[PDB]
Every structure is written in C-alpha cells, then in structure tokens.
Amino acid sequence: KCSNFFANHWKGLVVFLVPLLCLPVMLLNEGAEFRCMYLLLVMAIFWVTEALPLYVTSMIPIVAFPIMGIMSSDQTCRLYFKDTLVMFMGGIMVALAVEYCNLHKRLALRVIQIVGCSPRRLHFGLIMVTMFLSMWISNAACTAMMCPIIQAVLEELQAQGVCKINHEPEPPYPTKITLCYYLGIAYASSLGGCGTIIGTATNLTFKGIYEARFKNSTEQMDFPTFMFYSVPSMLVYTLLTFVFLQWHFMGLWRPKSKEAQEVQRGREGADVAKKVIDQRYKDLGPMSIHEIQVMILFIFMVVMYFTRKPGIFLGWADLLNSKDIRNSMPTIFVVVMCFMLPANYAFLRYCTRRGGPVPTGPTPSLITWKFIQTKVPWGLVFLLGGGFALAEGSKQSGMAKLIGNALIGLKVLPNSVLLLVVILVAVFLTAFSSNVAIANIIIPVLAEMSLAIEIHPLYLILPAGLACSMAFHLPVSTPPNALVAGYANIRTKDMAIAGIGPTIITIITLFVFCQTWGLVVYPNLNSFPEWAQIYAAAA
Amino acid sequence: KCSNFFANHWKGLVVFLVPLLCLPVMLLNEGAEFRCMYLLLVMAIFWVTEALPLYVTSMIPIVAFPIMGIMSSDQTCRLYFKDTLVMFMGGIMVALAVEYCNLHKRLALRVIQIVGCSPRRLHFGLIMVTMFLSMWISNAACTAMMCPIIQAVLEELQAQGVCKINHEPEPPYPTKITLCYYLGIAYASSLGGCGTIIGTATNLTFKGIYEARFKNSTEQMDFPTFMFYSVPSMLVYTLLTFVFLQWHFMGLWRPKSKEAQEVQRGREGADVAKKVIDQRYKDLGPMSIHEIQVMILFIFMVVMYFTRKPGIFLGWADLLNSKDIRNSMPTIFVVVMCFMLPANYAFLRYCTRRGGPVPTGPTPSLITWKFIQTKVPWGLVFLLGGGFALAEGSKQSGMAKLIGNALIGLKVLPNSVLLLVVILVAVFLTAFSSNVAIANIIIPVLAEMSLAIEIHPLYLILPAGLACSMAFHLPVSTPPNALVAGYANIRTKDMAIAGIGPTIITIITLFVFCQTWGLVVYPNLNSFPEWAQIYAAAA
Numbered sequence A, B: 001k002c003s004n005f006f007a008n009h010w011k012g013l014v015v016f017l018v019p020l021l022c023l024p025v026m027l028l029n030e031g032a033e034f035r036c037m038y039l040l041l042v043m044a045i046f047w048v049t050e051a052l053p054l055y056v057t058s059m060i061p062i063v064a065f066p067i068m069g070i071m072s073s074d075q076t077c078r079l080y081f082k083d084t085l086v087m088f089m090g091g092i093m094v095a096l097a098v099e100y101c102n103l104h105k106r107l108a109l110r111v112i113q114i115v116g117c118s119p120r121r122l123h124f125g126l127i128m129v130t131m132f133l134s135m136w137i138s139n140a141a142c143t144a145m146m147c148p149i150i151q152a153v154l155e156e157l158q159a160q161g162v163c164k165i166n167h168e169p170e171p172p173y174p175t176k177i178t179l180c181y182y183l184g185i186a187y188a189s190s191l192g193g194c195g196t197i198i199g200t201a202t203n204l205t206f207k208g209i210y211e212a213r214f215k216n217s218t219e220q221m222d223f224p225t226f227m228f229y230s231v232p233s234m235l236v237y238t239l240l241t242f243v244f245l246q247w248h249f250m251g252l253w254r255p256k257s258k259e260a261q262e263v264q265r266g267r268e269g270a271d272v273a274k275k276v277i278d279q280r281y282k283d284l285g286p287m288s289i290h291e292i293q294v295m296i297l298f299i300f301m302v303v304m305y306f307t308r309k310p311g312i313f314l315g316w317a318d319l320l321n322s323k324d325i326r327n328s329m330p331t332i333f334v335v336v337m338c339f340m341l342p343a344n345y346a347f348l349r350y351c352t353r354r355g356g357p358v359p360t361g362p363t364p365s366l367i368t369w370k371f372i373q374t375k376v377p378w379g380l381v382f383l384l385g386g387g388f389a390l391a392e393g394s395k396q397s398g399m400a401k402l403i404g405n406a407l408i409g410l411k412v413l414p415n416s417v418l419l420l421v422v423i424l425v426a427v428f429l430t431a432f433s434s435n436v437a438i439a440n441i442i443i444p445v446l447a448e449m450s451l452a453i454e455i456h457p458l459y460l461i462l463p464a465g466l467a468c469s470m471a472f473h474l475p476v477s478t479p480p481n482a483l484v485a486g487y488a489n490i491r492t493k494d495m496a497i498a499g500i501g502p503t504i505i506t507i508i509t510l511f512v513f514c515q516t517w518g519l520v521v522y523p524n525l526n527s528f529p530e531w532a533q534i535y536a537a538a539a
C-alpha cells in the first residue's frame, strides 16, 4: 500500500519539496550570489532527477533572473540562440537532408561489401561504419538507422539455420551473438559521437561555455583544431573496444571454448547466405543525381569549415575582414542551396533534345520543409540556451568566485591526480543521467577551480568534456542504450557486466593521450599562460 | 507545349533570374547601402512571389550580412529570438494547453446555447464566439476548431430535410446558406485577429519594428494601451460585417426575396432540431478540475499583463525595479506551471479518506511535451527574426536615410490623403501575399517617410499595421480563406463578390476611428513631438 505510493508519485514529491527545502540558503545569507546558488541547486536537482522534462526545466532562468537582481529580460533572451547554436541546428538540418533520399544506406552497404564475409569481419565493418556516421549525426538517429540491416541478416541466417537469434524455451533471452552485434552498434555510436563538434550536443556545450568564459584565451577550440585533437584517440579506443567485444562474446583468444565453435560454424556455410541477402538488400538502383548533389554540398560544407582560418594561407574570413564571419554562414548557405536546387533536371527536354516525356508537374527540391519541421528536436534550443544562460549568470553574480575560493584546498595534489579524479567523477556522474545536464553542471565549476589554482583551464576542461560522453552501463545512461535494450530485450545485468571493458579502455586512453599528445597539439598546456594570470588577478 | 512550361516551372525561373537581374544595382553604385538595397529587393520579391518557403527565405540575412560590411555574425543571430518573440511563442504554447482538455468546445457551445434559436441568431452567436476565440489564438487554428460544429448542424438539418447543403445537379455548388456560414466564420477569425498583440503575427511584427526603431519614444504600444486602442473599432466593424452578410445571402431587408422565405421556413421549423443536436454535443460530461486549473492559469496570466505598469497604482515591475522585467515572465511562468501541476488529485486517497481506488500509475500533467513539439509552427521564429534583422540592417547601413530623402516630395499633400493612400496601398498589397511579408516590407519605409516629413510616426504606422490584416477577396490572401474554400468547395468569383463589402467597411471604420478616437487614447498625434524632432535632426 503505502510502499507503492512512493514508487508511483516520487517525482511530484521532489517537485514539491526541493524548492521548499533549499529556501534557507536564500534566507540565511544576504548576497545575490546566494540566490544564484539556490537557483543552481534547484536546476541541478531537476536535471539529475528528471522530475520535469529537460526542455521545460531549461526555461526557468527566463523567469528567475529578472525577478532577482541578476539580469534583465532582454539580455537573458539574447543569451539563448547564439550563432553557435544556429550552426548546430543547421548541421542537424543537413544531416536530415542526407538521411532523406537514402545516401547513408548506400555508404553502409558498400563498406560492408568491401569488408570480408567472415562473421567477425562483419562485426568490425558494422562498428566502423557506425563510428563514421555518428561522427556527423546524432547518436540515437544512427542507431535507429543501422539496426534494421543487422536484424534482416540475422533473420535470414536463422532461416537457413546456421545460428539462432534467441535461446530455445517473459520475452525470449537473446543469445551471445545478437548481444554482441547490438551492443557493438550502440557503443560504436557513443564512441564516434565524440569525434566532431557537430557529432553530439555535449561537445557544443562545453566548447560554448569555455569560449564565453574566456574571450581573451590564445588557445581556440575551432573546428579543425578540435578534430585534430580528438580523432586519433577516438580511433584507438574504438579499435580496443572492438577487440574487447570480440574477446568477451566470440571467444577470440580461447579456441577450445564452445563459443568459438559457433563462430567456426558461422564461418563455413553462412558467408554465402549473408552475402546473398546483402546483395539483394543493396537493390536501391543506379546512383541518382539527387544523391550526387547532396554529397557535393556536404563535401563543400566540410571544406568551407577547414579553410576558414588555416596557418598555411589566409583563406576566407581573413579576406572578408570587414566584419567577423563565423562557421554559421557555411551551414545555412548549404541549407538554402538545398532548398533552391532541383532534383531531376528533366525539364531540359523542353529547351532542346526532346527525348523522353516532359514532367507533368513542378519538380521537387532536394528537401521539403514538412520533413524538417517534423523531425528536428526543437527542445535542444531551450536546453543549450539554458546551459549558456546559467553559466553567464553564475559569472556575473559573483558566485563563481565564491566556489573558486571554496575549492582552493585541492592545491596540494599533483596535476595527474587531479586529471584522474576529474575523469572518474565525470564518468560516475554521467552514468546516471543525461550527458548535457552533467556537462552544464560541472564545466563552470572546473573553470573556476582551474582559475583558483595555477592550472591551464583546457588541461582539465577537455578531458572532462570528452569523458562526459562515455556512458555504457545502464539503459538510463544514454538514449542509444535504451533503444538497443528495447529492440533485443537486453536485460540490465548483462549490459552492466559488459560495460566494464569500454569504461576502463576509455579512461586509460584519455589519460595517456591527454598527457602525451595534447602537448603536441597545444604546446602551452603544462605552463600557466599570461592571460590566465591576468584573469585570476582580476578575479 | 511551350506554353505550359511557364505554368509548371515559373518558380525556378524566378529564383534563377531575379538575383542576376538585380545585380547592376550593386555594381553601378559603390555604397554599402546599395548592397543592402539589392538584398532588400531580392527578399521582397521572394516573399511576394513565394518562390521559396517563407521560413527558408527569412534565413538569408544570416548568410548575407556578414559577407557584406553590414553586421557581424554574432549580432545578426542576436537579432533573432528577441524577448517579444519568446512572449509570442509562450502564448502559442498556452493556447495549445487551452486546446488540450477541450475548454474551447465548452465555451463555444455554452455561448451558442445562450444565444437564440433562429438561424440569424445562430449565425450572430457563431461569429461572436469565433471573434473572441481568434482574439487569443491563431486564425487558421480557430477556423479548424470551429468548422465541425456548423458542419454537423447543417448535416442534421439536411437529414431532416428543411434545407439543402448543396444545389441539386465537378464538385457540387454550395447553396447560399452554407456560403454565408463558412465565409462568416473565416471573416470573423480574420477580424478578431486584430484585437490583441498575441492575436496574430502581424501585430507583433510592426510593434517590434516600431519599438526597435524608436527607443526614446514617449508613446508606447504596451499590452493594455494597444488593446484599448483596438477593441472598440474591432467591435464596430465586426458588427457591420455581420449585417452585410445577412443582407447579401439571407435577404435581411427584403421580405419578398426567396432567401427571406427560406429563412422564414428555418424559423418556423427545425429550430428545435438544431437545439437537440446542440445539446447532444453539449453533453461532454461535467466540467473537470483539469479545465478549472487551466482557466484559472489563463485568467491569472491576463491579469498579470494588465497590472504590469498601470497609471492608477505602482504594481509590480516597479516594486522589482532592479531590472526591466519587460513582461516576459508571466507567459513562461504559466508554461512551466502547466507542467508542474497534476491533473486528477486522486492520489490524496492514500493519506486519508480512501474512498475510491488509488491510481495505478503516475498522474499526468496538464500538458505533455509531445503535444507541444508536434503542433507549434517553429518556422515563425525564422520569419520574425528575418523581419527584425532586415529592419535593423536597413537602419544601420544608411539606406533608410536615402529612402526618406527620396520620398520627401509627398509633403505637398494634406494629412488625410496620406492616411487614406497608405491604407489603400496596404490593403491592395496584402490582397496577394502573406500578411507578415507585407508588414515587413512596408513598415520601415513608412517610419522613414514619417521622419522625413514632420509627421508623428504612430499616425501612419498604426492604421497601416492594422490594415495589413484585412484580406478577404482571394484564397491566396490568408490561410483561413484557403481552409474555408477547401471545406465547402467555394468558387473564387463568388468569394470575391462576397468579400467586396468588408473591405469597404474596414477602410471607412479605420479611417474614422483613427482620426477621432486615437487622439483620445493618445493625445499628441497631431503635433510633432520633441523626441521626433531630435531623431530627425540627428538623422
């Protein structure tokens, strides 16, 4: 009776009680920094617990700041919808354009065909394609995009009878092979998300917070530099994750294991079956002009990103130095070009070369607004903006200096220990909640702590920002885990056991690579730069 | 052959040719204001013609301005998503919450029950309810909300056989009664849109442009003052539109007319029939706590709008004088409170008075995020932002001074003829295209022309801003017209012949009321205020 009441209505209890319980923080102390602290506590608890939808919770600052003596209404709204957010939303639109007309399927099928027929080889190909696609597209999208192929091939293999998808006789228990495939897809999506700024929202969040906090910083997380910093480690731990997954389920190094016998059986007689099903499933047809135009536009957008400000040559931006151009212009330009261009080029028959029937109606464009309006996750605007506004208000109120003075005690420990504990704390926190919320909560605190001690802010911000995305244990940790658990009825215990490998691999790889190669990309990480001294002295 | 080629593919021809044709404007003159003028011409032609979707076209300034010397990328994105736009979007969300749980149906049915039984009385009540609903909600939404009731009552009457929906024998021709009802609903929605700032987008557009251009203006279009200025005229010409429709289709003043004889039959019988069917739709069950909570929240929001800064008493926004609240808090506050509050209060059986069964799951909130995400027209953000950015860029580049000096020749004519010609031009232009585009095009030009001559800007801005919404002649003019034409297969010729009336009525009413009662609400229209003199002298 009374026990299940907490089980059903705990969210309402949190919503009702937390604002009342946190009130003495405001009443006891007089400064406005304490009001900002009260707001921070309430919003952090709402994000972690998820009592309210994240998008709704992100709207609180609009109400809260003008009531208090923090910010005016117009400035708070200006903090939302920065140019960087426009770049991200345009990137989502271009990804939608790619998804439309089915370019992704052609790329995935071709790479799998290039990779070998053996079942171990098929797993390797699937992970690599997912990592490359998640590098530019949202993670949950990529998981949904990739699952049907493996589902179809597994069903065909079961039809031949070489392997069984489920245990023979409460949903049926999945076998080891399907667990391996699905978990590999989800993990590959999560790992590949970290490669690029537009790969996932968390990268955008901490990049934006760092840029807003320190305008005078001489080290920049622009698009090429971040990609240079991130790609090699991503490749290394993706490969190591693949090796660990093969060891855990396929019996890679144990020849006498019974699991290895199943792999050997799959090697002989199932290669032809999956090859036939893959060839038939690649029946899209000859490559149309639609896909060619979309691909050319995408490549042009990437090239525009890379050419904005290289050290080799001036490039654009330097030539157009009248005003400050940003990477927002290349994206929106691609979106507009996608809307203007046609899709068939069949109307040329009118002017000359009257071969074939003329079109009977208006030629469709590359994309339609109805598709965009129904698929874009518009709440990300409020979520990212709320993070930015909270950071800015915390800076202006002066509560950031209060935390900075509070945490000064950590100066005793050496830098490496700080790096390790920061990574561990970030992983532990992101295990239980959304990545973006954890990033918003922890990044400004790290910035202020790094200012209080004499440590370069990037040296702590980058590893933590990357580590916030590493979530593998529980279904609640990340949406791809929930989708994969739903598709194949994966029990939580098995996923929790399997998640041990990627966590250790990512932690070790991040530690070593940030210690070694970050100095190669950023020479001044070890020392304390001049502008950091100026900022700390002003603080 | 070649004749139909223009019919099929004219939009692509416009998109390809117009930028090439307007290019000599940029090449011949070296000023940056000429580049801004080229941009203005291109966007104006794209909006009027609708070669591209409006939302896509509004995205051009983000790409265009930083390339030229007009503005930086950061500021251009800041221009989008202002405070006022956030207020409007929150208002749309609250309207969606009202649509949820079906409060509007109860209100409309109750008012129709209050009004009498004769078809004239039913028509009058239906128009009044449509006007009141459109005062707070989008026009097309209200039309879709209201049509099914009249459809049902007409079908029931046809089943009884008192009147025929369509002419007896290509879609069937609707009879005069059906035309009257549907056209009345559409016209009522269009007319009631003008009552309030959040009623329609055009009001928001010109209010925002005026506020951005003149910060120092003493006269203000705040929420209560605008409503005071607008409501009485709205009532007068809504009533006059009702009388014209009754004379045109139901022979109100002519007893001998056959149409009057059909009305007499409708009064003699079947009034009890429509009353019975109306009661059947009224049986929605007793009013629930859900609706009561939503209604209380809505009333509280409106009261919060009025008490922001009244002349009678200080109110809020003066007690909290640390920052300018700027009327954004109430709307987002209501949106958040909609998610926070429950919907049943059936969980209290746990504590005491067990009574009925306890709930078996979490209690739903007043609204769900899925409903909001799928129904909000998100492209309005880009449309309004593009309008604001174009206005600001025109101000900064210096094109405004050029146009104002160009149009100085109109000083010869007296004030009244300027008012009349402005109203006529606004109506003629809005007849053929979207209202928001016309407002965006014409408002800044009016502001600059008003500065060039010694005329108070409001004197011309308000009548034109209201006149942009008056569109009845063609289905292209406004979405409600298209919906009504689709529902009842209305022919365009009949629609124009019917709409000839409300145009004249609205023009005369606006002229007289703006000349007479605007002085009562704003005392200083006739004179040229000091701040206007300062602005003109500086510019």
Ligand SMILES: CCCCCCCCCCCCCCCCCCCC(=O)O[C@H](COC(=O)CCCCCCCCCCCCCC)COP(=O)(O)OCCN
Pocket: A008, A009, A010, A011, A012, A013, A015, A016, A019, A020, B339, B340, B341, B342, B343, B347, B362, B363, B364, B365, B366
């Ligand atoms: C200078 C000083 C300034 C101080 C400023 C302070 C500002 C504070 C602002 C926030 C104040 C609290 C707001 C609470 C809103 C209502 C929350 C109700 C949640 C609820 O339904 O809880 C149920 C259990 O309630 C319980 O167990 C508790 C009993 C709840 C009874 C109803 C309470 C709300 C009644 C109206 C209060 C007044 C509102 C207007 C101010 C379970 O809900 P669930 O989990 O099943 O579903 C939840 C999703 N729907």
Ligand SMILES: CCCCCCCCCCCCCCCCCCCC(=O)O[C@H](COC(=O)CCCCCCCCCCCCCC)COP(=O)(O)OCCN
Pocket: A339, A340, A341, A342, A347, A361, A362, A363, A364, A365, B008, B009, B010, B011, B012, B013, B015, B016, B019, B023
């Ligand atoms: C020095 C500074 C200068 C600054 C100012 C200039 C800046 C750049 C301006 C660029 C403007 C856009 C250029 C590309 C527009 C392409 C539009 C094509 C539209 C189209 O398909 O038109 C069809 C007929 O075209 C026709 O009959 C038109 C002629 C033939 C068009 C096809 C061949 C060209 C294809 C595009 C080449 C682009 C090259 C440059 C990137 C009918 O289409 P529809 O109406 O049935 O369907 C339309 C679905 N949206």
